[PDB]
Amino acid sequence: KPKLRFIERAPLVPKVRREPKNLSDIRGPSTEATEFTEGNFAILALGGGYLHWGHFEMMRLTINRSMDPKNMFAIWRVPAPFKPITRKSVGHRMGGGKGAIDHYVTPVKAGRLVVEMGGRCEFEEVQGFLDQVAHKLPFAAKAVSRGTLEKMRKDQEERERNNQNPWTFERIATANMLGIRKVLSPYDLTHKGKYWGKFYMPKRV
Amino acid sequence: KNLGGKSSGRRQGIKKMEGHYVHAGNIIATQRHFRWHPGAHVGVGKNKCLYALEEGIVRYTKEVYVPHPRNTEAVDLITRLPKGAVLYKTFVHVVPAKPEGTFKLVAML
């Protein structure tokens, strides 16, 4: 089964309890599926967002059509949509209770791998359509191999080490210099200024 | 569809933190479940509130938990515990300050 598996619109057992939109699941760096597993190429999420069944279908169809099943294999690194999103009826005034469940999404945090590909192939063969998929994803994304991912991580570390600016967001936030914690968020103490909402500023040091 | 859930907060919790001088009968902590367990010179009410049985200083400690043999649920938990394991709970203690009393010369017969 080398080709990418089908993803269902909603969980087979539908959720009954509406749940709050905890945007923290999109906010911040990703702590899961951040490393390669049984593959050499992948789509890395350089930002946060929700993946709909439409995005899943786009990824599946594009990758399946453009891959070589006898020499390439692909695997999801993101679960099927599970978080329920509720929409009220059009023309409804505010109030009257939380709306009924409309769709299911899967939260994705910046720094996570969405699809992982491997097999008897090199990056150049796959980067084309992986970049197509990444550009059509709801969040900033990039086709990255193991080597390129390590290269970008080492480049970030090098920039952090050799930055000539005496002042860093990390230092100022941690020390509460200028009383900037009045303007910053408690999450900023760990985001170090590299994350703003769902957006991940990669050039930010 | 969702009715109820309007109950207010019980205002429960610790009323006397560690180091606080406490007179006999003072309520040290009110709790719905057994968060802090009664220690020396601390009594439990019907609603699990901890009150000071003596006048002294409140101290919170961690002490091994040995339920009464007739506490069937706790004894079952222990029976299922692996060997070498020891349960611990937070206990509230009242270190009595004053002595029970003094011997005073009342009459020089």
């Binding site: 941690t174 020390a175 509460n176 210099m177 200028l178 009383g179 914690r181 009045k182 408690p186 | -």
Partner: protein
């Protein structure tokens, strides 16, 4: 929620480079701080307002002498972004009763005990 900020202790552990830069020997630390409020307590939390009042820094640009001791240091850490802290220097030693009326706190942070107002 915006809350009081707990400054990590590593911030207040000087390095040899800091010692060379700011001219202070880790041994033989200075005894007294000259503290001047260089920032308004307006638009700042009420706890910072209260700490400023406690330190007696209500007027800006008005130096105040304080003990270089852990508790005063804790208060100064709380309100460190509103104040300028310098070490009080005593080139001629502590003022005595005789010269108590001739002192002056120069902008360098030195409490000169003779103030003649004459050319050197």
């Amino acid at each position: 929620k915006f809350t009081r900020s707990r400054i990590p202790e590593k911030v207040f552990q000087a390095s040899p480079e800091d010692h060379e830069k700011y001219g202070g020997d880790p041994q033989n630390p200075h005894k007294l701080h000259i503290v001047t409020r260089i920032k308004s307590t307006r638009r700042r939390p009420y706890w910072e307002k209260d700490i400023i009042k406690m330190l007696g820094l209500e007027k800006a640009h008005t130096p105040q002498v304080h003990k270089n001791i852990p508790s005063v240091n804790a208060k100064l850490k709380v309100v460190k972004h509103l104040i300028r802290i310098k070490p009080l220097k005593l080139p001629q030693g502590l003022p005595a009763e005789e010269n108590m009326s001739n002192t002056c706190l120069k902008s360098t942070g030195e409490l000169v005990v003779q103030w003649h107002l004459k050319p050197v």
